[PDB]
Amino acid sequence: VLSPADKTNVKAAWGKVGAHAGEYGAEALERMFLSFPTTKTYFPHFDLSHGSAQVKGHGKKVADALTNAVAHVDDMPNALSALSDLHAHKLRVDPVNFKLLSHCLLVTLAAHLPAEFTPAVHASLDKFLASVSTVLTSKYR
Template structure:
């Protein structure tokens, strides 16, 4: 199910419905258990992303040429990025009741990935799927189908919001080479 760069011209997303109070509580309760193993879970998520979608490594100059999974797992740069990803998710989850804080975090993430790193927004959707997959496998007793549905909705909201920020800053995909 790997997508090749340039295969998707643009990412069209529908605005998800807002999280209910029950969904917010389920997400926060499940995250509290997951976040206890923050670094390991973050590394597992990034490793899964890079194994299943190797093209995604193109955005990481520090470790994009590392092919060996064990070597990737030991990369201090990968661990540092995993920690940042998990920290951003943690800030979102902790502030689900504070729409302004959530919007602020998503704006920072969206602008950085659009303007500084030039990451195609489709990778947020791909990463969301990887996050759901890893959480479901690593924490099946915590991420039940009902909790998974709430996480799906949260991650869809994240993707929608980040894509809106990309649009706001005028991000355009790099032209695919035709050679």
């Protein structure tokens, strides 16, 4: 569960992510595709090569969704209701892929923000990404 201190740390970390969110998400998607190729089965229509414009656009969309979740950290299920329905029903993405993407996002943030990825901030960001994944995987069946 996200404590108020954890919410503060997540808000600060994503604020210092700032405008680099789109390419952070693109890098996280690339890391998920390379490290865990089993997640590529959910993108059969995407060009999954390095530096892909389509992967970059999807990473921008993912980071915009994460920004909306951070801004609505107290109402995340309502903020991600459309995405929850989408991932759970239309795409039927298995939650292990969500945890893999959360790990890859954490790796990207650690590689790009080493000064601000403190163990407390790392734990808070992991909790926030777990909350996002749980909201998106809740309706999975």
